[PDB]
Amino acid sequence: AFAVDAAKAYKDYLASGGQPITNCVKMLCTHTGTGQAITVTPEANMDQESFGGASCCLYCRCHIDHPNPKGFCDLKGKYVQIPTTCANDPVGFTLKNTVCTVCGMWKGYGCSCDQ
Amino acid sequence: AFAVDAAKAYKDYLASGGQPITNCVKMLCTHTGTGQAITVTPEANMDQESFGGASCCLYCRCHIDHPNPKGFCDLKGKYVQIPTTCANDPVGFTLKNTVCTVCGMWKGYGCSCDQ
Amino acid sequence: SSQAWQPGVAMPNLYKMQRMLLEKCDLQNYGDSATLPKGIMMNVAKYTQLCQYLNTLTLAVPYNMRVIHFGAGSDKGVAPGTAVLRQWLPTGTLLVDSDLNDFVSDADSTLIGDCATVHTANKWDLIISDMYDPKTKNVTKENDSKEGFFTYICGFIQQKLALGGSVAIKITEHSWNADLYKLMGHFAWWTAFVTNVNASSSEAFLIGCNYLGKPREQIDGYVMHANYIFWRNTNPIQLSSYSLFDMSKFPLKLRGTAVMSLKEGQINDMILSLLSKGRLIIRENNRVVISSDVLVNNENL
Amino acid sequence: SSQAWQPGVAMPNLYKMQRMLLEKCDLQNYGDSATLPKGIMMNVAKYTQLCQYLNTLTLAVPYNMRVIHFGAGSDKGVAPGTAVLRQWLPTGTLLVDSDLNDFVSDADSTLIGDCATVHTANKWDLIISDMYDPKTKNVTKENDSKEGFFTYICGFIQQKLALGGSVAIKITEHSWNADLYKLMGHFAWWTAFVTNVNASSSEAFLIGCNYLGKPREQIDGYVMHANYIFWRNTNPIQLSSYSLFDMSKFPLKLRGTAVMSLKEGQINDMILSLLSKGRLIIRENNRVVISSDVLVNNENL
Ligand SMILES: CC(=O)NCCCC[C@H](N)C(=O)N1C[C@H](O)C[C@](C)(O)[C@@H](n2cnc3c2c(=O)n(C)c(=O)n3C)C1
Ligand SMILES: CC(=O)NCCCC[C@H](N)C(=O)N1C[C@H](O)C[C@](C)(O)[C@@H](n2cnc3c2c(=O)n(C)c(=O)n3C)C1
Ligand SMILES: C[S@@+](CC[C@H](N)C(=O)[O-])C[C@H]1O[C@@H](n2cnc3c(N)ncnc32)[C@H](O)[C@@H]1O
Ligand SMILES: C[S@@+](CC[C@H](N)C(=O)[O-])C[C@H]1O[C@@H](n2cnc3c(N)ncnc32)[C@H](O)[C@@H]1O
Ligand code: NA
Ligand code: NA
Ligand code: NA
Ligand code: NA
Ligand SMILES: [Zn+2]
Ligand SMILES: [Zn+2]
Ligand SMILES: [Zn+2]
Ligand SMILES: [Zn+2]
């Protein structure tokens, strides 16, 4: 019944004042993109930065298994858009937040399906 | 500065009443062996069980990196002798205990270099 | 009745000489289970008894022996059989294992994926296979020779087993292959061995002892499997774990068997005789390099 | 002076035609650094400018393009260059990368180990290498042609690059190989390209554009490297990151270049002409399978 909870470990490490994971790979892009959360190519808008997906995945970066039963990665091989105000901690951001399955924007950072 | 502490996670999981990791590979042997902690072949004495090393390694079993800088495993490819009274939790035992570098017995379970 | 203190029972020579038709396998003690020592898994007991039986044959045991083990993972994610093989084999023996799914192992190297993706430059002294697909136990369809991983194994033996080397390949009533039986005739000796702890199962290990690289005898594989089932159908084997309690002579004795590099033309009758007796291995003695093929593809857009 | 708005500077043809002796490289602006956009790593900027320059050449861009990237890991454990390559390449492009040490990557498949252990069945449309050993920057010893991974790369190009494909191989003053320069003459066109963000370094990318599989011109590699250093020594390049701010035309245009399977005898002058223009790729179109050799050994007793 034992499984390491890396997600909770990182969350608690951040709460206690630990420095966010660094060296996430920020891409050059137009910043005139769709603003969707996770895309096949950088899609940052004016208020976002785009990063290589693998480098923003806690499981990829920590060399641990992915929480999927198939062990598949949401981010590897794609690009993740992070709000510029949150780009000091892309791993934290992707961990804590969730993508709307309807419009593809980050819930609470672009999703407007609630009106 | 962030690193998962699987050793502490397992220790805390055990403290809280979680069931020890199962399916450690117990070997058939004479039980007339040297009783040393970690050996190239099963060396259980009358008061020990011998297990395949990899299956008693928290890092091997959890698919996470080994705490060595080179990532080398103390147990993989060898056999670990566990006191019979402790054989319900070989991963816990090897994690919590330390091998005497002089005689090769478990400190406090065979080591008598202190007299 | 002495069989209960043996590690298992080998198919008696007279049954090998028959010409039976294939029947359904009906074991008297199907469903029964032997009583294992406290806390010992079936697969540890099974491999222990297999190794105890192999101790009675003329295995070549060279310095820097090379052993590969297919089907080495369990549904528990560990490798019980590999751990018994490593206990059995001399210390320092190069052990490689493989399985379709991920598992943690005591082998010196583990390859994950279908066995067909496994490639090796060098030759081996001993090949162990526990590969098995339980889907084959379909009693409602005819029982024909199977391909799949058995095709790989036959090719691997002909291409990568050293002369003088040996094999043990797990089969069952439905998991079997005619060419593999035919290939048993390319060894100095062969049998089908049933472990006493698993005697209520149609499982056996097909053992080829001392590889000769050419037919020593012609074996029809469809007939031989029918002979094997006939033997199993008419000779109940009493479940037993007795041999598990005496491990004092378990270690495979390091015979220091000689390794020689030889070419096709130089394998005369004197060499063949040495091979047949477990006194010689023929293969290069280079370093051991292995790899698994990885299929690459990009599933985006 | 317009060079500052380019992604970099390519070695001018007249310098390629010289016959200089090899000198020490002395860059006017050694030690200076360009001012990168906020939070952008040098290696992202470097690969972006390299891809911007490659956009000006006649690259073949087939459907289901195949790209392999050697030296793809950083000391940070991630793969910045691979991420830029994947941004640049059409979506769905098969991307494989490799490095000596472990790293996490956006490539479709990553192989860890010395490049010499990397094997592939299939041919590639584009080969990128950033392999580099900083130990070569030893100024106190003579500067001779280097082997090591350059030997692998030359063989990989001759054996595994599709006709019509292209390469970009990182070199420096001391990290270079004469045969690789010679091999540049087996492409329809070649250059040494210096990125504007790294112009204070003797680094360049040796680019072979549209592979022809045979010498189109004879190049002495010792002389050509001397020509390259002469150019660098006499043409200061102003550090610049200007081109990083305009990415609207960055994506490699999917030209749908035709792929054909052809045999040695059928490569006439019409085909060669098509290859030379980036209008044709010649290789099988099977599935992509890769592997890395693993050395096996048992260090017990
Ligand atoms: C005294 C009393 O009440 N006993 C009645 C209950 C007996 C229960 C036991 N499961 C049994 O013996 N049976 C009952 C079947 O009807 C006959 C059959 C199918 O041939 C048996 N059987 C033999 N070897 C078998 C199989 C078999 O299915 N399979 C799948 C095999 O692989 N093997 C090797 C199975
Ligand atoms: C106005 C004022 O006070 N400036 C004085 C301070 C200048 C500092 C700067 N580091 C420099 O230019 N130097 C000073 C050396 O004495 C001359 C030398 C060795 O040739 C220079 N240099 C040129 N290209 C170089 C190298 C070099 O070492 N290496 C290793 C190269 O790879 N390349 C490509 C290095
Ligand atoms: C009976 S289990 C063997 C368990 C293992 N020997 C042990 O000691 O517990 C059979 C194994 O064969 C493997 N197998 C079946 N078909 C295979 C194939 N085509 N290639 C590789 N492995 C295969 C399965 O994954 C399964 O784990
Ligand atoms: C300049 S770094 C490249 C970093 C990477 N391209 C990036 O985007 O940041 C050079 C790399 O080449 C690798 N390398 C050097 N020699 C090698 C060899 N013989 N085989 C494989 N990789 C090698 C080193 O491990 C090193 O990480
Ligand atoms: Na079966
Ligand atoms: Na053998
Ligand atoms: Na250098
Ligand atoms: Na190309
Ligand atoms: Zn991931
Ligand atoms: Zn939405
Ligand atoms: Zn371990
Ligand atoms: Zn001691």
PDB file of N, CA and C in Angstrom, chain D residues 143-183:
ATOM      1  N   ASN D 143      47.532  21.386 -31.787  1.00  0.00           N
ATOM      2  CA  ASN D 143      46.115  21.287 -32.142  1.00  0.00           C
ATOM      3  C   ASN D 143      45.971  20.393 -33.371  1.00  0.00           C
ATOM      4  N   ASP D 144      45.844  19.094 -33.141  1.00  0.00           N
ATOM      5  CA  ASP D 144      45.687  18.140 -34.228  1.00  0.00           C
ATOM      6  C   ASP D 144      44.227  17.715 -34.398  1.00  0.00           C
ATOM      7  N   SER D 145      43.946  17.110 -35.551  1.00  0.00           N
ATOM      8  CA  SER D 145      42.621  16.569 -35.810  1.00  0.00           C
ATOM      9  C   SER D 145      42.257  15.565 -34.718  1.00  0.00           C
ATOM     10  N   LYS D 146      41.016  15.633 -34.243  1.00  0.00           N
ATOM     11  CA  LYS D 146      40.569  14.800 -33.132  1.00  0.00           C
ATOM     12  C   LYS D 146      39.741  13.624 -33.638  1.00  0.00           C
ATOM     13  N   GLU D 147      39.787  12.530 -32.885  1.00  0.00           N
ATOM     14  CA  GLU D 147      39.037  11.324 -33.211  1.00  0.00           C
ATOM     15  C   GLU D 147      37.823  11.200 -32.306  1.00  0.00           C
ATOM     16  N   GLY D 148      37.818  10.207 -31.420  1.00  0.00           N
ATOM     17  CA  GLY D 148      36.731  10.096 -30.456  1.00  0.00           C
ATOM     18  C   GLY D 148      35.394  10.119 -31.156  1.00  0.00           C
ATOM     19  N   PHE D 149      34.481  10.964 -30.670  1.00  0.00           N
ATOM     20  CA  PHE D 149      33.141  10.964 -31.248  1.00  0.00           C
ATOM     21  C   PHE D 149      33.119  11.451 -32.698  1.00  0.00           C
ATOM     22  N   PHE D 150      34.117  12.221 -33.154  1.00  0.00           N
ATOM     23  CA  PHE D 150      34.122  12.608 -34.568  1.00  0.00           C
ATOM     24  C   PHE D 150      34.258  11.395 -35.485  1.00  0.00           C
ATOM     25  N   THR D 151      34.975  10.361 -35.045  1.00  0.00           N
ATOM     26  CA  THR D 151      35.064   9.153 -35.854  1.00  0.00           C
ATOM     27  C   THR D 151      33.689   8.519 -36.014  1.00  0.00           C
ATOM     28  N   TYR D 152      32.967   8.369 -34.904  1.00  0.00           N
ATOM     29  CA  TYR D 152      31.599   7.865 -34.962  1.00  0.00           C
ATOM     30  C   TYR D 152      30.754   8.686 -35.929  1.00  0.00           C
ATOM     31  N   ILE D 153      30.812  10.021 -35.804  1.00  0.00           N
ATOM     32  CA  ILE D 153      29.911  10.891 -36.563  1.00  0.00           C
ATOM     33  C   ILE D 153      30.157  10.751 -38.061  1.00  0.00           C
ATOM     34  N   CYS D 154      31.425  10.647 -38.473  1.00  0.00           N
ATOM     35  CA  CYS D 154      31.709  10.478 -39.897  1.00  0.00           C
ATOM     36  C   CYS D 154      31.141   9.163 -40.412  1.00  0.00           C
ATOM     37  N   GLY D 155      31.304   8.088 -39.642  1.00  0.00           N
ATOM     38  CA  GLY D 155      30.733   6.819 -40.053  1.00  0.00           C
ATOM     39  C   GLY D 155      29.218   6.877 -40.072  1.00  0.00           C
ATOM     40  N   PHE D 156      28.625   7.489 -39.045  1.00  0.00           N
ATOM     41  CA  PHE D 156      27.171   7.582 -38.989  1.00  0.00           C
ATOM     42  C   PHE D 156      26.621   8.319 -40.197  1.00  0.00           C
ATOM     43  N   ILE D 157      27.309   9.377 -40.628  1.00  0.00           N
ATOM     44  CA  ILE D 157      26.858  10.138 -41.792  1.00  0.00           C
ATOM     45  C   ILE D 157      26.930   9.282 -43.052  1.00  0.00           C
ATOM     46  N   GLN D 158      28.050   8.593 -43.255  1.00  0.00           N
ATOM     47  CA  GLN D 158      28.188   7.813 -44.476  1.00  0.00           C
ATOM     48  C   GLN D 158      27.241   6.623 -44.488  1.00  0.00           C
ATOM     49  N   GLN D 159      26.933   6.060 -43.325  1.00  0.00           N
ATOM     50  CA  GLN D 159      26.094   4.875 -43.275  1.00  0.00           C
ATOM     51  C   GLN D 159      24.615   5.169 -43.058  1.00  0.00           C
ATOM     52  N   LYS D 160      24.260   6.234 -42.333  1.00  0.00           N
ATOM     53  CA  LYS D 160      22.879   6.402 -41.887  1.00  0.00           C
ATOM     54  C   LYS D 160      22.235   7.729 -42.284  1.00  0.00           C
ATOM     55  N   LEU D 161      22.897   8.575 -43.073  1.00  0.00           N
ATOM     56  CA  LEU D 161      22.249   9.788 -43.564  1.00  0.00           C
ATOM     57  C   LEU D 161      21.615   9.533 -44.928  1.00  0.00           C
ATOM     58  N   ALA D 162      20.331   9.855 -45.052  1.00  0.00           N
ATOM     59  CA  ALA D 162      19.660   9.707 -46.331  1.00  0.00           C
ATOM     60  C   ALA D 162      20.259  10.657 -47.359  1.00  0.00           C
ATOM     61  N   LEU D 163      20.337  10.202 -48.609  1.00  0.00           N
ATOM     62  CA  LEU D 163      20.651  11.127 -49.689  1.00  0.00           C
ATOM     63  C   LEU D 163      19.657  12.275 -49.663  1.00  0.00           C
ATOM     64  N   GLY D 164      20.163  13.496 -49.819  1.00  0.00           N
ATOM     65  CA  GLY D 164      19.352  14.678 -49.668  1.00  0.00           C
ATOM     66  C   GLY D 164      19.294  15.240 -48.260  1.00  0.00           C
ATOM     67  N   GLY D 165      19.695  14.459 -47.250  1.00  0.00           N
ATOM     68  CA  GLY D 165      19.646  14.932 -45.880  1.00  0.00           C
ATOM     69  C   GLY D 165      20.761  15.918 -45.555  1.00  0.00           C
ATOM     70  N   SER D 166      20.692  16.493 -44.359  1.00  0.00           N
ATOM     71  CA  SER D 166      21.617  17.546 -43.974  1.00  0.00           C
ATOM     72  C   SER D 166      22.150  17.296 -42.572  1.00  0.00           C
ATOM     73  N   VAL D 167      23.253  17.989 -42.231  1.00  0.00           N
ATOM     74  CA  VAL D 167      23.876  17.870 -40.913  1.00  0.00           C
ATOM     75  C   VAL D 167      24.327  19.237 -40.410  1.00  0.00           C
ATOM     76  N   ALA D 168      24.404  19.350 -39.082  1.00  0.00           N
ATOM     77  CA  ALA D 168      25.043  20.474 -38.395  1.00  0.00           C
ATOM     78  C   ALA D 168      25.792  19.908 -37.190  1.00  0.00           C
ATOM     79  N   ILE D 169      27.123  19.976 -37.225  1.00  0.00           N
ATOM     80  CA  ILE D 169      27.998  19.325 -36.247  1.00  0.00           C
ATOM     81  C   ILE D 169      28.807  20.419 -35.563  1.00  0.00           C
ATOM     82  N   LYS D 170      28.688  20.526 -34.242  1.00  0.00           N
ATOM     83  CA  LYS D 170      29.422  21.569 -33.527  1.00  0.00           C
ATOM     84  C   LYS D 170      30.919  21.279 -33.525  1.00  0.00           C
ATOM     85  N   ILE D 171      31.715  22.305 -33.831  1.00  0.00           N
ATOM     86  CA  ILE D 171      33.171  22.261 -33.736  1.00  0.00           C
ATOM     87  C   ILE D 171      33.631  23.485 -32.952  1.00  0.00           C
ATOM     88  N   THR D 172      34.919  23.495 -32.593  1.00  0.00           N
ATOM     89  CA  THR D 172      35.587  24.652 -31.980  1.00  0.00           C
ATOM     90  C   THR D 172      37.003  24.721 -32.549  1.00  0.00           C
ATOM     91  N   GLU D 173      37.811  25.652 -32.033  1.00  0.00           N
ATOM     92  CA  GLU D 173      39.214  25.705 -32.449  1.00  0.00           C
ATOM     93  C   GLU D 173      39.900  24.355 -32.258  1.00  0.00           C
ATOM     94  N   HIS D 174      39.725  23.741 -31.087  1.00  0.00           N
ATOM     95  CA  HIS D 174      40.378  22.477 -30.764  1.00  0.00           C
ATOM     96  C   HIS D 174      39.510  21.241 -30.981  1.00  0.00           C
ATOM     97  N   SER D 175      38.188  21.375 -30.962  1.00  0.00           N
ATOM     98  CA  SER D 175      37.301  20.232 -31.178  1.00  0.00           C
ATOM     99  C   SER D 175      36.906  20.207 -32.652  1.00  0.00           C
ATOM    100  N   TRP D 176      37.667  19.464 -33.458  1.00  0.00           N
ATOM    101  CA  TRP D 176      37.454  19.397 -34.900  1.00  0.00           C
ATOM    102  C   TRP D 176      38.076  18.112 -35.426  1.00  0.00           C
ATOM    103  N   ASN D 177      37.734  17.781 -36.669  1.00  0.00           N
ATOM    104  CA  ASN D 177      38.178  16.541 -37.295  1.00  0.00           C
ATOM    105  C   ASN D 177      38.346  16.762 -38.787  1.00  0.00           C
ATOM    106  N   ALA D 178      39.479  16.314 -39.332  1.00  0.00           N
ATOM    107  CA  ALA D 178      39.764  16.575 -40.738  1.00  0.00           C
ATOM    108  C   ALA D 178      38.825  15.806 -41.663  1.00  0.00           C
ATOM    109  N   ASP D 179      38.498  14.551 -41.329  1.00  0.00           N
ATOM    110  CA  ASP D 179      37.611  13.783 -42.202  1.00  0.00           C
ATOM    111  C   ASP D 179      36.228  14.399 -42.278  1.00  0.00           C
ATOM    112  N   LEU D 180      35.756  14.988 -41.179  1.00  0.00           N
ATOM    113  CA  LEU D 180      34.447  15.624 -41.203  1.00  0.00           C
ATOM    114  C   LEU D 180      34.425  16.783 -42.196  1.00  0.00           C
ATOM    115  N   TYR D 181      35.488  17.598 -42.225  1.00  0.00           N
ATOM    116  CA  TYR D 181      35.598  18.627 -43.259  1.00  0.00           C
ATOM    117  C   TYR D 181      35.642  18.002 -44.652  1.00  0.00           C
ATOM    118  N   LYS D 182      36.462  16.963 -44.830  1.00  0.00           N
ATOM    119  CA  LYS D 182      36.477  16.262 -46.109  1.00  0.00           C
ATOM    120  C   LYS D 182      35.076  15.825 -46.505  1.00  0.00           C
ATOM    121  N   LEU D 183      34.310  15.325 -45.536  1.00  0.00           N
ATOM    122  CA  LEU D 183      32.969  14.827 -45.810  1.00  0.00           C
ATOM    123  C   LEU D 183      32.016  15.949 -46.220  1.00  0.00           C
TER     124      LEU D 183
END
